[PDB]
From a paper:
Five H LCs (H3, H6, H7, H9 and H10) and two M LCs (M7 and M8) were successfully crystallized and their 3D-structures solved.
In H6 and M8 dimers all six CDRs (three for each LC monomer) are traceable in the electron density; in H9 and H10 five out of six are traceable, in H7 three, and in H3 and M7 only two CRDs are traceable. Analysis of the data shows that the kinetics of proteolysis correlate well with amyloid propensity: H3, H6, H7, H9, and H16 are almost or totally proteolysed after 60 minutes, and more than 50% of H10, H15 and H18 LCs is cleaved after three hours. Firstly, and somewhat unexpectedly, the most temperature- and trypsin-sensitive LCs (H3, H6, H7, H9) could be successfully crystallized. Such results indicate that, although characterized by low stability and high dynamics within the group tested, these LCs display a properly folded native structure devoid of large disordered regions that would hamper crystal growth.
Residue numbers in the entry:
A (entry chain A): 4 to 25, 29 to 87, 96 to 208
B (entry chain B): 4 to 24, 31 to 50, 57 to 87, 96 to 104, 109 to 209
Amino acid sequence: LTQPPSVSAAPGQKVTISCSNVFVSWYQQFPGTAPKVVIYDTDKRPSDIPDRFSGSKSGTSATLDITGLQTGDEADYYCGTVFGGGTKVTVLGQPKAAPSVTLFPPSSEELQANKATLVCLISDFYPGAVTVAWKADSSPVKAGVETTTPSKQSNNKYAASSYLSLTPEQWKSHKSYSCQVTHEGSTVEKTVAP
Amino acid sequence: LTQPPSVSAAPGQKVTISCSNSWYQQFPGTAPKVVIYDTDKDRFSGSKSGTSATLDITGLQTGDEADYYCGTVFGGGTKVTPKAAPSVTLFPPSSEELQANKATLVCLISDFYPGAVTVAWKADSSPVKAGVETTTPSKQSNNKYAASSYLSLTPEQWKSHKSYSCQVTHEGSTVEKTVAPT
């Protein structure tokens, strides 16, 4: 049912993806490509796939293990009984970098037009997997939220943006609005107010 | 398992997907979701004759535009395939940011179809490329696209010029918005 959004490691190290709340199959899926069974029935692996891939189960959670990591393994990994969330595996080729989070309020022009949009610019982060959560007066918000998918920049780090669309009164009613971004277990929150 | 790489249709009609020798729907950036299970099982048909299995989309909506796979091992995949102008929104540097002696402008491009755009910045009609990054489009919830561009400046490099502007091109049309230090 639930897996980390991202797992990363240097081009030789071990990656361990964890599927939680559970026979478990693991499917590897490259962009455009169909998902393919990397491991079936907890630990049994198909032929043609390398020895590097191994499946395990501890308690309520089952794990996928990738040893001798290589750029070829850079993919989205899903667990299945239904499917889990998905884990993006990254083969680290540069120092990890925490995103810089810049939260912008609606301009005087946008409000003058009876529109309101908050923009949370997330930039300079590697690996390219981030989680974004909005909060209106310390209370979560998922309605109105729209997030860009990470994109490799000029410096090889990634950049994305999340925006919240609101009514000018919604903006003025709450004393605050926050943008929480999560990158490799490191969370950074920024707030903006009228 | 074999499948037609792509199947085209018109909104309000029907579309067919064949699988040779369970059906799953996959939108970008998400896991697949079991639509029909064991030729029977959110209302579409998944009936089959001979060595092949077909999946039919009853009401051809826009929220059904996804990759469809079949299983027993997954089929190769089949991608099931009205113009909207981009909404360009320009933001000045945050009052918070200028107190940290940094400054960034964000050009937010949204609610557009098809998902392909171009960007160009200006600092009083003089085009600038210095510290400009543009993100790649992504299909938002309303089926139309979103992408953003940003310009990194110094608090003085922003307050020196009278105005700043991004210029967004999309299907031969061009949108330009302007911001000036307050």
